[PDB]
Design goal:
This is part of a larger assembly, with one copy of chain A, five copies of chain B, one copy of chain E, one copy of chain F and one copy of chain I. By secondary structure, chain A is α+β, with helices and mostly antiparallel strands. Chain A is built from 23 helices and 17 strands. In chain A, strand 5 and strand 6 form a beta hairpin. In chain A, helix 8 packs antiparallel against helix 9. The chains are: A alpha+beta, B mainly alpha, E alpha+beta, F mainly alpha, I mainly alpha. Strand 1 of chain A pairs parallel with strand 1 of chain E, so a sheet runs across the interface. Chain E: It comes from Chlamydomonas reinhardtii.
């Protein structure tokens, strides 16, 4: 077969017009929040329509009267829920004539328009049609005979008290009978303009994605995974808009940064030296004057892989960073004695010989979580301990749980999407009720006299919900958490009981005052006139209180006598019988259940925080709020690999350190007396017999100064340069026994296998189609 | 503790009784002119839209809009318990 | 209008340590570990 | 075996940290939500949203509002029911606003296409020919050769990844299946395209091989060797002894 | 029968084909023809599409204000280099196509010939003529003299960078 | 082994479950947030206390919204990213094993195939290979097919 | 864009762009289209009074319907617009040595780690369930 | 760890020192030499030894910040501290946001799944409560104390004129990157645009009762439920010219309501017989 | 007003905190009763040495080497 990788490049000939019809006439789903694209979309449709009639993407005559009708109704359709018409009128036209508009290719508007329909007649104002649409949507009467609103206030808006006038097309749409959705409300009041009659909500506006390091992602194009970073601010995102710049910043506190930057923020790779203060997200107490961090930066944070070096203290850390703190695997060395001997006039070789062994013995490998070292709170043994705890249960519970695990999967495999949504809603409701179950049936009662009264508890509380945790939060178990100036490093030093009770009483009277203010401010408005639901209870979330109160009042003797006077002028049993039917239908008597319960409890349970793995990826019902304060600790090979890659990252990042003419280079490169020095970084001048450093033919003409350490350094630099070179230049005909040869062999094998698979698919298609 | 336990509770009970009386009068306003739940009542708009969003994303093909009632919730709970 | 607010990080660290020791079913080590941590704060 | 599988699950939950993740718990000393917020907003990402078009230009109310009330239209010379709502028909005329916007878009498209016609770009063609004939003749590549070079680069990156210490990990298979073998994106194969706006060249050029049989837009250039390579290419001849 | 087994085996092979840790029998295999050192044939006729012309124009627009940097043998960045400074350094024989350069549109340091449009900018006809003169009459005799004078340049292992300077 | 072969894999089911759960949770939270903002706005406007206005401003904190994750797409909740797989062109070039064959046969027959014919052809093609061929992005053999279909014959 | 200085005159490395992109300012038809008001014909009378000439001019199949698509075809031509055109389970040795016995595989499972891990988890669950049921009987 | 490492050297890339060279006087060899030994970064910029006596620089490195100093170098610092940003409401709220989490859907849950006088208690027949209830009992008292501390109604009643009392959560951090202010660059709509600015009805007059009776009669006694949500569209009057009719009287035009015979539906009857437009400051702009 | 030291060193006493606050923040010209020379340099340098002993030791060794009195340095 022909070699795909050895085609003769004698004649190169491409045929592609720059305004490419493949790339130009196309609408992307990536362009969703952009309004102008909508117009383009319609235009594109028109093009296709013309191609369907003339085949030239250009219309004879021009845009006709029926093109707008087609593009309005027939072109694109939107999802509705359900119609339910009727065939008989329920109103009378005996009132002032021309009150209701009449209602009896005539198929539709487009069919009539293409059959010679002028559509030129104009009549009536828009407000009448919008009011009629709202009235039919409500299925009520919103205006009386005189024309004054019946469901909204008709008096002029009081400028005092903060109220302002509101049009009907807004009030009758922001306040609706809950069987009308936002889309139908917008469609009823003729909201058509794309640019001015639409706004983006605070919680629904488009924002760039967050990908972090961007390692684990679904690749839309498998060959190039960088294509999936186009919607983020990742340093390697394609075409940011402004080129990444080699920033060399000196801050007023003498903190210096040198490396890649996006906009004006450090971004990509670089080296940062700390002066007074801090930077790169580090804590104020971590750094000193002269410490440095080399490695990856992201959004001004030391995020990724790097190395932190402190010349004053000697600590050296190599490894992973998240945000501005150590998070992941890391390796720690303490080279303090080496620096101590170096600063006291000892040559480096002698100091290394003296202090190599002690430093090598004290090398530490660790796993860090949010800047804290793990391994002291038995983080390593958590999983095994939890497995043993799960194994310590009674056999019946374990068997039932294991059967339920398979039953859930088998049930979910065959459910409909609507059934899945309902199931997830039920699960969410159950999870919520596991913390705050409503006091249904215990909100209102009747006293001895028969008067309805609220049902309080052993305290001054009507429901378990408190509005003070909204500003302070709640832990996983139920405790609140830190507050303003909470002090009490450990709460084993509690507050005095007298102060506690006094403050509790003061909080109770404050709650009473708050309730009084809320009532006197919001209780006058009416939300639901059928049940007397005011705005205060509606906005406090106590609608079920009113729902129970209505039934309690109507069932009371006083309520019954009032109803008589004005007239003068699931259940527990259902669940029980369903459970009994389920028990009977399976052939399991209650005696068997009692026997099994006795066997489990008296014979097994008497013989001798939810179950599961605390560190689990898939958890069915999660809530995305429970937080793990630990991670699987790195093993030695993983730490070694992390250090090996971090050293590569540091070496690659240390290439932005001495920009030729930059502020840091001009102001921080000094001799012994502190005066500036003329660094040999001229692009054309190589003085004092250093022309061997020229990376060209000129360098070969001159000789090296004959220093073994310099020769080793040059050899290492040459090795790095060759390693960089090999990644962009290949051989046309590789020799057998080399890596590139096996790569080419595998590529050819892949092509052959794909061709065979396609041939088999074609054979199957031919068999099916004939 | 006694001052917090008894007096404040009585004051809160009295205020709740006054508000209950006002709410009862508001209800009586409609009850006078009435001159006369079902499983067909629709849910709150939040729960009516979350189901639509989950159906839209989860399904292989987008589906039409629905207005969920309490009967569907009852059916789902019954199925899970069964 | 100066309303003081304190940075409570040691309290949160102690609470997280208690939670981690609770999840490992090793509460008997609590008074052994937490105390040591407090000493680490002192010096 | 159960302990091993649970450790694998815990390791996968640990690996979750290297991609998109929700941060829904604000705690003292945790800087992750601040980093997420600064990454979401803090840099400007170009996108033609409503906020951008309102920023550009709205209108000039010299004579007041330029848009007026809508006028319903009715057919004079001859519906699926749905008579609940009467739909607006003010736009069925050709002299309306929507037709004006459509004609504006059509005119823009036609004139943009006519702007790049070959006979209006002769001097550019001559100058580009003169400029591009300066490079050596062996630097020109076919599209298939460029794709082969890209594939070779990323396969060689994977091969060099296969030599790291990560292979000795207990859970190396999970890491390779989930992450990809390296803990940094910078140690993999990627194109050198970090200038210009993405949303502006979407309809002009191609940026990924899957878009079609086109030359991708990038600022780097893989090449074939034009001679028998000397191993000590960057080595000084004095060092080789 | 056998067809289905072969298809399943081929699918299994496809599953693990690009797993570079797994050895493969097609590695280091005997080619259909004996191996001889070949080179890619030099193209003769090139026909650019308008797409390529416009892409080149756009790239030239992006890089018309760039300032370049390069690295020496000691791995030190060297000087702020506008286009004419780069041309002078190329003519003087200080840099060549293998030098590591950096500009605005890149993320890392790459060889000069691997940057998209850097060699066409430098290589004006005058630059070519001057670099040919410099290579032929100044650097080559000096290299011969330094090779003859000092024995530290091993005859069997001699670099050929001066020979290819003209390109 | 039978349960695994039947498709009852825990991960592929739990992923969808958590995606739907997050989808419902986002809406259920953003509606209560709106109600709590409206209550405070009405208290501040119709009343005369600045404390409720400051409470509404605190509820309008961008950091709180970002931490809640309401702006982020629901996919980022579970761990993956939103992919527009339909934007990429669907042609013979880099088509996949089945799609390329279907398009070639349609071109040979000069007429587009229907849904039932396409389903039957794809089913038989998958069955003849034992079903081991990649069909989803997470399959390990997608990259090999993509590389194999990356060269256009001259 | 009369509110801003909508032109780019930056020199050297210095240059910033936000919501006024490089392509709009410097490149191609975006820059050319963004300045379309320079080529709009205006009515002017140098000597005669404005209102009288305007009234006379106003005193004197429509334009937008047909002429818009006619003039574009006549003047600005482009072909794109105006041309008609078994061992199916692969277990590592660490996984293999953890199985209690030597078991036989009768099914070919799709390649991948997730399926193998799911099979192992299901086997563990089944073994535990069987052990508990046997003990409780 | 008992793994082979002799074939390689653990370094994929060699670590090369990157330091520029310069020529100077060694004063130890007493020779003019080219080297790369630069002054340490722990002493660069702090002092110079030009004169035989060392000179220490005072002003150059700043070691403190005040209001004016912060205002002069506001956009040139690498970090921002809470000690100065605590006097701005938005900055303080960004430093210490609300801790609201684990929402309870009290507005939407409503109905549940399936369906009290004081009792004299003798002390001798009571048993100690388990440890799982003491914490729950203490939680309510802790919440009451938190409400006393953070929502003292006395202070917030007179806060604007002579005090400062704002709702914030616990302090999460002390320093932030100096470019966090950019998060506030894109603003949100004012609350008046999002919500309605006037209350619904407060009284039920004759026409309202008639309409409610008709609506209830239509639905076989199953009354409707009303919800109050945010605005669905912007005000049309701000960007559009609309006709004004009579004194606000509206006569809707529509088709008749569909189900006749005996009971029809009747609309209730109460009696039963030119400058330049100013420019508003938009909030959703770049 | 802060002095970059109350946020860095967590063991500062009230007197040392006030000394740093007056020395590097709210200078004598920024205080209503401030006068030149209010902050003593010797006490501030002593506090700085107490907060970081090793840097002071290194500088002392450097000074002794410059003065050629290393015996007195090592005999301390
Ligand atoms: C009044 C000022 C000008 C007076 C001289 C007239 C110049 C007229 C022709 C110049 C066109 C040059 C480019 C032609 C295009 C072309 O065919 O290039 C041919 C040649 C490039 O040569 P290559 O490098 O291809 O070949 C060199 C070979 O010897 C290696 O095989 O370019 C020149 O000769 C450059 C001329 C520089 C000027 C040389 C004289 C310097 C005088 C200084 C005083
Ligand atoms: O429940 P009972 O058996 O009826 O006993 C109670 C009990 O007293 P004894 O424990 O001595 O029986 C009460 O005291 P405590 O146990 O709660 O401490 C006491 O009330 P005091 O606490 O006020 O003493 C009360 O008597 P009384 O109701 O008269 O106060 C008395 O009930 P009897 O009086 O019916 O025996």
């Amino acid at each position: 077969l022909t070699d795909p990788l050895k085609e003769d490049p004698t004649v190169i000939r491409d045929e592609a017009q720059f305004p490419e019809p493949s790339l130009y006439f196309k609408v992307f789903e990536s362009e969703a929040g952009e309004p102008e694209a909508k117009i383009r979309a319609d235009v594109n449709k028109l093009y296709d329509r013309w191609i369907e009639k003339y085949g030239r993407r250009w219309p004879e005559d021009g845009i006709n009267t029926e093109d707008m009708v087609w593009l309005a109704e027939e072109a694109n359709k939107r999802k509705r829920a359900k119609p339910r018409p009727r065939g008989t009128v329920a109103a009378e036209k005996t009132e002032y004539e021309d009150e209701f508009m009449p209602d009896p290719g005539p198929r539709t508007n487009y069919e009539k328009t293409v059959a010679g329909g002028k559509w030129v007649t104009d009549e009536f104002e828009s407000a009448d049609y919008e009011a009629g649409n709202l009235e039919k949507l409500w299925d009520m009467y919103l205006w009386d005979r005189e024309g004054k609103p019946t469901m909204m206030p008709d008096t002029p808006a009081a400028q005092q008290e903060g109220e302002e006038s509101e049009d009907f097309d807004d009030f009758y749409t922001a306040y609706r009978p809950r069987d009308v959705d936002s889309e139908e409300a917008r469609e009823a009041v003729w909201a058509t303009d794309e640019f001015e009659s639409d706004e983006d909500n605070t919680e629904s506006e488009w924002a760039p994605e967050y990908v972090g390091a961007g390692l684990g992602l679904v690749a839309e194009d498998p060959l190039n995974p960088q294509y999936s970073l186009r919607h983020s601010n990742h340093p390697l995102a394609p075409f940011p808009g402004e080129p990444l710049k080699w920033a060399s910043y000196v801050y007023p506190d003498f903190t210096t940064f040198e490396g890649l930057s996006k906009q004006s923020i450090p971004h990509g790779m670089g080296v940062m030296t700390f002066g007074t203060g801090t930077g790169a997200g580090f804590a104020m107490s971590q750094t000193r004057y002269g410490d440095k961090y080399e490695g990856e930066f992201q959004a001004g944070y030391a995020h990724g892989l790097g190395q932190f070096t402190s010349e004053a203290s000697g600590e050296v850390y190599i490894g992973e960073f998240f945000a501005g703190q150590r998070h992941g695997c890391g390796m720690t060395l303490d080279m303090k004695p080496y620096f101590y001997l170096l600063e006291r006039g000892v040559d480096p070789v002698e100091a290394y010989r003296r202090t190599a062994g002690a430093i090598m013995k004290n090398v530490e490998v660790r796993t860090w979580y949010r800047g804290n070292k793990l391994g002291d709170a038995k983080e390593d043994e958590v999983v095994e301990i939890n497995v043993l705890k799960d194994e310590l249960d009674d056999p019946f519970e374990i068997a039932l749980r294991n059967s339920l695990h398979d039953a859930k999967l088998r049930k979910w495999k065959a459910m409909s999407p609507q059934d899945k949504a309902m199931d997830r809603i039920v699960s969410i409701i159950e999870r919520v009720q596991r913390r705050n179950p409503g006091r249904f049936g215990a909100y209102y009662r009747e006293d001895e006299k028969g008067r309805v009264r609220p049902v309080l508890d052993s305290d001054g509380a009507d429901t378990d919900f408190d509005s003070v945790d909204m500003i302070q939060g709640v832990d996983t178990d139920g405790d609140l958490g830190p507050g303003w100036e909470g002090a009490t490093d450990s709460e084993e030093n509690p507050m005095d009981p007298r102060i506690r009770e006094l403050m509790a009483a003061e909080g109770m009277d404050d709650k009473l005052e708050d309730e009084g203010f809320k009532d006197t401010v919001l209780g006058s408005a009416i939300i639901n006139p059928y049940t007397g639901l005011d705005m205060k209870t509606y906005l406090d979330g106590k609608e079920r209180h009113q729902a129970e109160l209505v039934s309690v009042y109507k069932a009371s003797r006083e309520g019954r006598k009032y109803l008589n006077k004005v007239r003068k002028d699931l259940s527990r049993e259902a669940e029980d019988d369903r459970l009994a039917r389920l028990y009977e239908q399976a052939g399991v008597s209650k005696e068997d259940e009692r026997r099994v319960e006795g066997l489990a409890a008296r014979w097994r349970r008497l013989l001798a925080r939810r179950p599961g793995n605390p560190l689990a990826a898939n958890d069915s019902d999660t809530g995305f709020e429970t937080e793990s304060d630990m991670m699987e600790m790195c093993d030695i090979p993983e730490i070694l690999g992390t250090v090996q890659e971090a050293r590569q990252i540091v070496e690659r990042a240390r290439m932005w350190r001495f920009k030729p003419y930059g502020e840091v280079g001009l102001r921080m490169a000094q001799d012994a007396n502190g005066s500036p020095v003329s660094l040999m970084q001229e692009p054309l001048h190589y003085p004092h017999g250093t022309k061997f450093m020229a990376p060209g033919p000129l360098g070969l003409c001159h000789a090296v100064p004959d220093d073994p350490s310099l020769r080793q350094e040059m050899a290492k630099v040459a090795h790095n340069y060759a390693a960089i070179y090999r990644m962009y230049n290949f051989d046309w005909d590789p020799e057998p026994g080399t890596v590139q040869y096996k790569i080419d062999q595998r590529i050819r094998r892949a092509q052959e296998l794909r061709n065979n698979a396609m041939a088999r698919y074609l054979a199957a298609a031919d068999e099916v189609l004939r | 503790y006694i001052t917090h336990r008894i007096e404040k509770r009585e004051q809160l009970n009295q205020e709740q009784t006054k508000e209950l009386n006002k709410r009862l009068e508001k209800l009586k306003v409609w009850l006078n002119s009435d001159k006369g739940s079902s499983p067909d009542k629709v849910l709150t708009t939040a729960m009516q839209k979350a189901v639509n969003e989950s159906i839209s994303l989860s399904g292989i093909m987008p589906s039409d809009k629905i207005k969920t009632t309490y009967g569907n919730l009852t059916n789902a709970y019954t199925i899970k318990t069964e | 209008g100066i309303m003081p607010r304190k940075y409570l990080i040691e309290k949160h660290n102690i609470k997280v340590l208690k939670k981690k020791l609770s999840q490992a079913y090793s509460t008997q080590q609590l008074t052994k570990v937490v105390q040591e941590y407090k000493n680490l704060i002192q010096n | 075996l159960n302990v091993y599988l649970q450790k694998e699950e815990a390791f996968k939950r640990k690996l979750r940290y290297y991609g998109t993740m929700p941060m829904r718990k604000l705690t003292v000393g945790n800087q992750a939500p601040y980093f997420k917020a600064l990454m979401k907003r803090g840099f400007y990402y170009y996108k033609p949203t409503l906020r951008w078009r309102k920023t550009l230009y709205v209108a000039s109310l010299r004579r007041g509002f330029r848009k007026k009330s809508r006028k319903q239209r009715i057919l004079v010379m001859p519906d699926g029911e749905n008579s609940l709502i009467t739909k607006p028909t003010h736009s069925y005329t050709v002299l309306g606003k929507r037709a004006s916007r459509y004609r504006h878009q059509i005119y823009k498209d036609v004139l943009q296409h006519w702007y790049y016609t070959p006979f209006n770009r002769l001097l550019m063609k001559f100058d580009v020919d003169a400029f591009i004939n300066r490079q050596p003749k062996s630097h020109f590549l076919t599209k298939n050769e460029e794709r082969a070079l890209h594939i070779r680069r990323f396969l060689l990156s994977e091969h060099y990844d296969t030599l790291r210490w990560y292979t000795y990990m207990q859970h190396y298979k999970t890491m390779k299946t989930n992450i990809g073998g390296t803990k940094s994106f910078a140690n993999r194969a990627y194109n050198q395209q970090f200038q210009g706006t993405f949303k502006k060249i979407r309809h002009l050029f191609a940026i990924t091989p899957k878009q079609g049989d086109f030359y991708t837009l990038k600022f780097d250039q893989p090449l074939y060797n034009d001679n028998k390579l000397k191993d000590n290419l960057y080595f000084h001849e004095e060092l080789l002894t | 029968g056998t067809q289905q087994e072969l298809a399943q085996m081929e699918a299994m092979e496809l599953a693990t084909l690009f797993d570079m840790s797994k050895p493969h029998p097609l590695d280091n295999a005997a080619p259909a023809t004996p191996w001889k050192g070949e080179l890619r044939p030099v193209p003769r006729k090139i026909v650019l599409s308008p797409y390529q012309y416009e892409m080149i124009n756009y790239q030239r627009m992006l890089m018309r204000k760039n300032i370049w940097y390069y690295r020496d043998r000691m791995n030190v960045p060297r000087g702020p280099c506008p286009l004419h400074v780069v041309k002078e350094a190329w003519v003087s024989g200080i840099v060549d196509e293998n030098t590591l350069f950096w500009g605005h549109g890149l993320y890392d340091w790459l060889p000069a010939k691997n940057i998209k449009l850097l060699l066409p900018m430098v290589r004006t006809p005058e630059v070519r003529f001057a670099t040919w003169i410099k290579r032929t009459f100044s650097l080559k005799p000096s290299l011969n003299r330094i090779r003859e004078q000092r024995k530290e340049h091993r005859d069997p292992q001699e670099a050929s960078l001066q020979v290819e300077l003209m390109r | 082994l039978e349960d695994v072969d039947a498709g009852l894999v825990t991960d592929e089911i739990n992923h969808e479950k958590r995606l739907m759960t997050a989808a419902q949770l986002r809406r259920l939270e953003v509606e209560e947030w709106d109600k709590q903002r409206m209550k405070n706005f009405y208290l501040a406007s119709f009343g005369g206390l600045r404390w409720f206005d400051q409470m509404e401003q605190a509820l309008h904190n961008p950091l709180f919204i970002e931490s809640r994750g309401w702006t982020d797409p629901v996919q980022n909740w579970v761990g993956q990213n939103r992919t527009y797989m339909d934007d990429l062109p669907a042609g013979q070039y880099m088509a996949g094993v089945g799609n390329a064959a279907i398009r070639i046969k349609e071109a040979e027959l000069k007429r587009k195939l229907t849904d039932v014919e396409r389903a039957h052809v794809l089913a038989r093609g998958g069955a003849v290979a034992g079903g081991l061929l990649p069909q989803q992005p997470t399959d390990p053999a997608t990259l090999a097919v993509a590389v194999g279909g990356a060269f256009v014959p001259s | 864009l009369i509110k801003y200085q909508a032109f780019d005159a930056s020199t050297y490395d210095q240059g910033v762009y936000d919501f006024l992109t490089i392509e709009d300012l410097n490149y191609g038809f975006d820059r050319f289209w963004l300045r379309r008001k320079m080529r709009n014909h205006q009515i002017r009378f140098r000597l005669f009074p404005g209102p009288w000439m305007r009234s006379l001019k106003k005193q004197l199949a429509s334009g937008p319907r047909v002429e818009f698509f006619r003039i574009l075809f006549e003047q600005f031509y482009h072909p794109n617009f105006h041309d008609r055109a078994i061992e199916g389970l692969v277990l590592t040795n660490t996984q293999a040595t953890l199985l209690p016995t030597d078991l036989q595989t009768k099914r070919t499972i799709k390649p991948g780690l997730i399926y193998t891990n799911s099979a192992l988890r299901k086997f563990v669950r089944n073994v535990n369930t069987r052990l508990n049921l046997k003990l409780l009987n | 760890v008992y793994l082979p490492e002799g074939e390689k050297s653990f370094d994929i890339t060699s670590m090369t020192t990157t330091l520029p060279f310069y020529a100077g006087w060694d004063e130890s060899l007493k020779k003019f030499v080219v080297t790369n030994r630069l002054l340490s970064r722990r002493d660069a910029g702090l002092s110079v030894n030009n004169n035989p006596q060392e000179i220490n620089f005072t002003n150059p490195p700043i070691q403190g910040l005040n209001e004016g100093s912060f205002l002069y170098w506001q956009t040139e610092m690498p970090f921002n501290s809470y000690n100065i940003d605590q006097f701005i409401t938005t900055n303080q709220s960004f430093y210490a946001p609300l801790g609201w989490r684990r929402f309870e859907f009290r507005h939407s849950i409503l109905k549940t799944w399936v369906n009290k006088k004081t009792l004299i208690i003798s002390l001798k027949n009571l048993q100690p409560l388990k440890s799982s209830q003491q914490k729950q009992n203490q939680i309510k008292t802790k919440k009451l104390v938190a409400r006393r501390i953070k929502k003292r109604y006395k202070l917030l009643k007179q806060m604007p004129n002579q005090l400062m009392y704002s709702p914030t959560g616990p302090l999460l951090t002390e320093v932030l990157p100096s470019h966090y202010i950019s998060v506030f660059d894109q603003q949100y709509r004012l609350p008046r645009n999002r919500y309605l600015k006037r209350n619904p009805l407060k009284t039920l007059k004759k026409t309202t009762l008639l309409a409610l009776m008709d609506s209830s009669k239509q639905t076989n006694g199953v009354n409707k439920e009303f919800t109050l949500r945010k605005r669905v569209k912007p005000r049309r009057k701000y960007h559009r010219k609309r006709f004004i009719k009579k004194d606000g009287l509206i006569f809707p035009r529509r088709t008749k309501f569909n189900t006749e015979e005996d009971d029809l539906r009747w609309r209730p009857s109460s009696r039963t017989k030119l400058r330049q437009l100013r420019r508003r400051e938009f909030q959703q702009v770049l | 007003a802060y002095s970059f030291a109350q946020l860095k060193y967590k063991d500062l006493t009230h007197k040392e905190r006030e000394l740093f606050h007056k020395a590097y923040a709210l200078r004598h010209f920024e205080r209503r009763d401030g006068r030149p020379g209010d902050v003593d340099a010797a006490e501030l340098q002593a506090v700085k040495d107490r907060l970081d002993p090793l840097e002071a030791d290194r500088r002392a060794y450097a000074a002794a080497k410059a003065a050629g009195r290393l015996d007195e340095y090592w005999a301390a």
